[PDB]
Design an enzyme around this catalytic site. Sequence first.
Site, PDB file in Angstrom:
ATOM      1  N   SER A   1       0.800  -1.203   0.000  1.00 20.33           N
ATOM      2  CA  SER A   1       0.000   0.000   0.000  1.00 20.33           C
ATOM      3  C   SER A   1       0.854   1.284   0.000  1.00 20.33           C
ATOM      4  O   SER A   1       0.353   2.329  -0.224  1.00 20.33           O
ATOM      5  CB  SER A   1      -1.025   0.014   1.124  1.00 20.33           C
ATOM      6  OG  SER A   1      -1.708  -1.214   1.256  1.00 20.33           O
TER       7      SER A   1
HETATM    8  C1  JPP Z   1      -1.714 -10.484  -5.029  1.00 24.13           C
HETATM    9  C2  JPP Z   1      -2.355 -11.163  -3.878  1.00 24.13           C
HETATM   10  N1  JPP Z   1      -2.227 -10.344  -2.718  1.00 24.13           N
HETATM   11  C3  JPP Z   1      -1.031 -10.621  -2.062  1.00 24.13           C
HETATM   12  C4  JPP Z   1      -0.936  -9.963  -0.709  1.00 24.13           C
HETATM   13  N2  JPP Z   1      -1.968  -9.053  -0.355  1.00 24.13           N
HETATM   14  C5  JPP Z   1      -1.789  -8.420   0.798  1.00 24.13           C
HETATM   15  O1  JPP Z   1      -0.780  -8.586   1.380  1.00 24.13           O
HETATM   16  N3  JPP Z   1      -2.659  -7.631   1.302  1.00 24.13           N
HETATM   17  C6  JPP Z   1      -2.376  -6.692   2.376  1.00 24.13           C
HETATM   18  C7  JPP Z   1      -3.011  -5.361   2.103  1.00 24.13           C
HETATM   19  O2  JPP Z   1      -4.039  -5.379   1.553  1.00 24.13           O
HETATM   20  N4  JPP Z   1      -2.384  -4.232   2.455  1.00 24.13           N
HETATM   21  C8  JPP Z   1      -2.787  -2.885   2.055  1.00 24.13           C
HETATM   22  C9  JPP Z   1      -1.606  -2.001   1.691  1.00 24.13           C
HETATM   23  O3  JPP Z   1      -0.575  -2.370   2.153  1.00 24.13           O
HETATM   24  C10 JPP Z   1      -3.601  -2.143   3.113  1.00 24.13           C
HETATM   25  N5  JPP Z   1      -2.699  -1.281   3.834  1.00 24.13           N
HETATM   26  C11 JPP Z   1      -2.359  -1.906   5.081  1.00 24.13           C
HETATM   27  C12 JPP Z   1      -1.821  -0.863   5.986  1.00 24.13           C
HETATM   28  O4  JPP Z   1      -2.142   0.256   5.790  1.00 24.13           O
HETATM   29  O5  JPP Z   1      -1.094  -1.188   6.875  1.00 24.13           O
HETATM   30  C13 JPP Z   1      -3.620  -2.547   5.684  1.00 24.13           C
HETATM   31  C14 JPP Z   1      -4.513  -1.543   6.351  1.00 24.13           C
HETATM   32  C15 JPP Z   1      -3.265  -3.651   6.658  1.00 24.13           C
HETATM   33  S1  JPP Z   1      -4.493  -3.123   4.300  1.00 24.13           S
HETATM   34  C16 JPP Z   1      -2.803  -7.209   3.693  1.00 24.13           C
HETATM   35  C17 JPP Z   1      -3.826  -8.085   3.816  1.00 24.13           C
HETATM   36  C18 JPP Z   1      -4.215  -8.573   5.035  1.00 24.13           C
HETATM   37  C19 JPP Z   1      -3.638  -8.168   6.199  1.00 24.13           C
HETATM   38  C20 JPP Z   1      -2.632  -7.278   6.091  1.00 24.13           C
HETATM   39  C21 JPP Z   1      -2.227  -6.814   4.853  1.00 24.13           C
HETATM   40  C22 JPP Z   1      -3.030  -8.825  -1.069  1.00 24.13           C
HETATM   41  O6  JPP Z   1      -3.949  -8.122  -0.750  1.00 24.13           O
HETATM   42  C23 JPP Z   1      -3.133  -9.487  -2.365  1.00 24.13           C
HETATM   43  O7  JPP Z   1      -4.043  -9.202  -3.084  1.00 24.13           O
END
Ligand code: JPP
EC number: 3.4.16.4
Length: 517
Positions: A248
């Site tokens: 992100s």
């Molecule tokens: C390609 C497949 N694949 C691989 C990996 N994957 C993924 O790792 N997902 C993470 C994610 O969505 N992170 C976002 C940006 O980092 C957001 N920002 C974070 C932040 O602000 O700390 C958050 C608030 C925790 S969610 C995630 C999911 C669940 C918990 C923590 C993080 C995907 O989603 C995804 O599709």
Amino acid sequence: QDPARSVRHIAIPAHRGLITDRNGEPLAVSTPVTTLWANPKELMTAKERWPQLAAALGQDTKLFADRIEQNAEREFIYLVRGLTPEQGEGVIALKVPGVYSIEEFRRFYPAGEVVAHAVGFTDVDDRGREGIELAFDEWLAGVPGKRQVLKDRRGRVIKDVQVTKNAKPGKTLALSIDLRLQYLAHRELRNALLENGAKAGSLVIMDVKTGEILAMTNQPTYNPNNRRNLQPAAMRNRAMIDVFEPGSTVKPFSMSAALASGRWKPSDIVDVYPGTLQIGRYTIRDVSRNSRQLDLTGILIKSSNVGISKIAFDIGAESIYSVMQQVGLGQDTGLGFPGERVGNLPNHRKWPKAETATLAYGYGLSVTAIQLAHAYAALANDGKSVPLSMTRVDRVPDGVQVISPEVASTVQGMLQQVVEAQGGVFRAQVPGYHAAGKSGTARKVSVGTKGYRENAYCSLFAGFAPATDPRIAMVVVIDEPSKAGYFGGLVSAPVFSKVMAGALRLMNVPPDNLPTA
Ligand SMILES: CCN1CCN(C(=O)N[C@@H](C(=O)N[C@H](C=O)[C@@H]2N[C@@H](C(=O)O)C(C)(C)S2)c2ccccc2)C(=O)C1=O
């Protein structure tokens, strides 16, 4: 026949250049050492002395005698390299025929582990092996001299004919790093690592106006003055060599591409209900899934993958790819030191939808912490990317406009809301100042090829301050924090807070969060 005389050339070893921090604090200092060598041909005429020599050298009597016997026809052999001049004096005082001194240099690193990955170190021969020592080895090393000597049939010097080439010292090198900021960073990354039972991490601080690396620290670290403990892992300059998916943290770049497209403004709305979005076999998902309409700021505050994905389908992946590339992600447009990894930005002629969305929210690419810091610096410096440097910059080179100043300023103010707004990353707030940035949390790629691990995370925060005249960009990357709270905003953002606070105060940056005057 044989040989009654020989003329040979022996090196005059050269003084390697001092490495300092940007304020002249010594970081790598050439230290007088005494290397003991012997001429076996002469040692052979004084065997009764060998045992007291072997004892002086901490060597077994017999193994020493065996060694000399086995090399009786040679004229030179090392006894030991690199002892202190005091210890070499102790062996020389024995007056053993055929035992001699060379006055040499070896490095000492007065800050030790605190700056070890950035400075690097030299090998046994005093040549750069890692980090700055290696990248600037030609500058630092200088040139060894040459002396012409006449020698008799058993390698004894009869006379010093002439100096054929003078030794010239290497040159002093001032890094961009401020050892005070470096120490702060060191300590706070260390503490957070321990607090979170994390495997590793990095932190990079950059001057957004000069391109200078003000600090670069990683965990684990090691003492470069005692590399006996040997562990390769601890020697990795992770900030420059360990690639990761930025997740992100790249959403501000996707948003810059949206703002630049003509098709989006901050107050436009995206419908992110119900927190997921199906794209053939893949499903994009948000972590928090109680939203419908979000404005562009809100997409960043809630960190909606779905919202950023829908924007990306509207503007097309090409525009997002171009931004990422122009700011240096996955590119070799950084320092380009020896050992440095470039990472990778995927490219397509026709972007499928899954790849478009994942790029926009930070998977399917891999970057280093230095890259990510440099990208943040360009955003913070009103879209202008000043070339990176690890050496002190007195004359700042021209920046390249990579994002339009207006777009960069708009995205800045969004990132300040990410930190300051309700529901934002409050732990990134910097007492005294307005700060701006973005949290990230990425599941790590499963080790045995494949896909992702549901247990293991990379915890990120990237930002800059003061939000309203930016000075400093910073990235904090913490690998596999092991406690309940593993989110970037819990794990990394407080390290940003503390180290940014200290750094702004060290640099005498005036507070900009003042009652409206
Ligand atoms: C390609 C497949 N694949 C691989 C990996 N994957 C993924 O790792 N997902 C993470 C994610 O969505 N992170 C976002 C940006 O980092 C957001 N920002 C974070 C932040 O602000 O700390 C958050 C608030 C925790 S969610 C995630 C999911 C669940 C918990 C923590 C993080 C995907 O989603 C995804 O599709």
